[PDB]
Amino acid sequence: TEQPNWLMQRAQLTPERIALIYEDQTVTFAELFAASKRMAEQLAAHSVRKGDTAAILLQNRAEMVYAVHACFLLGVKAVLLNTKLSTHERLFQLEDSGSGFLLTDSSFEKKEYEHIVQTIDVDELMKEAAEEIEIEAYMQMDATATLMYTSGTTGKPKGVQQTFGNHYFSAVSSALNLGITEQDRWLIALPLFHISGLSALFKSVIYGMTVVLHQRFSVSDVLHSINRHEVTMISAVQTMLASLLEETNRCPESIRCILLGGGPAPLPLLEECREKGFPVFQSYGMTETCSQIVTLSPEFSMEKLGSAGKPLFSCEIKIERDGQVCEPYEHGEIMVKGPNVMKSYFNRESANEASFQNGWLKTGDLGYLDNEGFLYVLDRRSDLIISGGENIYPAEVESVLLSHPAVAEAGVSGAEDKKWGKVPHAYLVLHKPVSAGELTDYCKERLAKYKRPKKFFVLDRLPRNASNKLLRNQLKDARKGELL
Template sequence: MNETFPNWLKQRANLTPNRLAVKAENEELTFDELYKRVQNRVKQLISHGVKRDDHIGVLMKNSVDMIEVIHALFSVGAIAVLLNHRLTNQELAFQLSDAEAVSVICHEELAGKLGEKVNVIVVDHLKEIESPVYIEEIEEFKADQVATIMYTSGTTGYPKGVLQTFGNHWSSAIGSALNLGIVQEDRWLLAVPLFHISGLSILFRSVIYGIGIVLFERFDAKKMNRAILEDGVTIVSVVTTMLNQMLVDLGHNKYPESFRCMLAGGGPVPKDLLEKSLTKQIPVFQTYGMTETSSQIVTLSPEYSMKKVGSAGKPLFLCQMKIMQNGRECSPFEEGEIFVKGPTITKGYWKREEATKNGFTNGWFHTGDQGYIDNHGFLYVLDRRSDLIISGGENVYPAEIENVLLSYPAVQDAGVVGIEDKKWGQVPYAFLVTTEKIDREDLLAYCQERLAKYKVPHHITFLEELPRNASNKLLRKDLRKYLEKGMSK
């Protein structure tokens, strides 16, 4: 793909300079104001040695600062490695080393999570550069040029860096617009993390569409509802636990008619929650996507939001989807693996040639997720990968937790599954075989040092042996049967 785009923010600031770009809790910026701030950030980054093609870690919380840094890295020509600030020091160290990051830009409060092996640029300490500094600003982005790297856990438990190009992000934005439409008065409420593809994609849509975003550092149901009721928000991206809390806080109130889309991802939304939304006339559009597809790739169209409750919809206009089982395409309602194809899909994983090769068949990407389509072509997602746990919108692979558990002395075998949780949707549940009695609290403390909080098991059951097949593969379905039989105490 040889297509090029003008520098997105520079072009937007030229086309509609006075439109709202971002409204945060303490400030508002137009696109022109944001662009001028980014130009200063470019000077700051260059003065700290950031160069074209560098891999630069971004360890920041949702903020105007973070938005400026991301745009500035693009203008320098560097690649942004988006880091989850909820990860442990060890997890971050692995990702930075694997990504070959030259430097990390972070907020001061997060600097302590970084070791001495990487150059740290604390954004709070950067000063405005008034003296003339020559900026060789990137004027064009190439479609096949890598813009961002995001790490996602794999079935082996070791995270992989997903390469996302400018073409991927552009196609995602265009595909979403062709489905949901664009209204000049649109404002997208952004409370999901910018280090996740769900949050980052909203930032790009804002610049490409020329619409404002209302930015929160973190989710707060009361503030979210207030923004919809008072700040002209028309679209919100949520996961199940967010939607549930917003409905509880909303009570008997209703959103204004100008509110047109509650985009729900991060796993299937429970039917009772969808029905509650229907009673309040809240248009919930279920959507399906992943880091590898640069956000949504299947989404309900507006006219079906009330008719196809429970479905994730159909592919975006630029994309394709099919259900496969044992090398053949499935019939309607037949369960199988979801395969997708289109310009939003990653070109591969950083330094993982085999994983990249195994992820595609004739241009079709293997999602590993299970689902089926009905006789009208609407997708119903059954499971986000057979083993994947989705806790509060975060993807958690059991294998990653098992690797940590197995490194603890006296743990001989470990298996992890997800169980339902009213607050988080799902939480990890561990089954262990040990060579001697161990202290449960010591084990959890060990995990907390090595895993993000949402990955630490909420429950532990000790067994004499774990169910495995002849090939020694762990049978997670059998572990779930232990829970169903009440053997979890």
């Protein structure tokens, strides 16, 4: 039911191995444990207690890694907050999560949250003297470690409860797939508040593996960093891979694995990677599976071009239509099972009842398996738009648009975008005139920037079925004029 705290044990086993490279900082596992314990002590001095919930609002930096591990050492659930969210969106997640604290810095406006949580500046925190404490030396496998918000298919996002067990089994299953060696170093230049970034921190302490952390994604900085630090592994979404290939015709020699996730990739991009020797491992995974659950090796990437691969060891996938398992090549809903699959959504009784069926999690994605068991994900959802690896839920954007007094009806669907894959376009029935710039300013207060419509259209009515349900995939074809 319990394991020794991974950072504590890692520091005991290999104290001088490098845990973290960030800018001009190198942090050993010993140093990482010491800094996380110290930050835990300082958090306890600000009244944080075992069983509490603390939200983290930070850009990628060493202090963010300290904060996550400090929470674990205190027995505190960590809520990772997307830094691009508006105040409005963050407030809901702070309240819904039951957070009592917000750990952030001066680059965010802490005063807007003071009425709901105690705000703590991590940089001021680390300057304070505090009494030493006895850390939580064990992680309970079934305890919720981290909460991440996703799947706002009805308008409001859901908090995914990711257990210590989930994170352990994710890391172990990935190691069994990719192999692990002492020379491996993993470069993370995508947000630590996504499980794409955060999972590398757990791989780091479980494997004893250096993570090279970047705050932002810059292709040239990433190429220099790979060279300087002999990076062997890197995670990416397809926009990042596309940017890498636009910069260089050759993959750095030390790279043995580019873990590609977070949405569909254009097939010409994957073919170019294979042609030019980029070792791309396409994968299928989500917040709810604590990162990858199906992954595709480069050796099959052209024979199975279009496939996400096979389930990781200990994990399972099946395709069902209305409760009937599908034959090979028959389309249906992707359902997943494994020790990396989340406990449940936080305080979403109805969603949990709907989403789980006899141990299996319904993903909401459509796909099929071929005759060898390889998964093919079909880009068919209209309740989800993926832009640069960021999920956008039409229901959330539509809810904001509908709240405007001039808007009578609202539909949002994804338009093709060469750089981002898909971007949201808005389709509106108006009571009164309103400009695109007016609505954009209105969305700016309520939506992260990547969620705001890139184009607006005005219609007399929206396409709906006999039950009055919006048919989002039919919005692009309706009679409309562009709204200026």
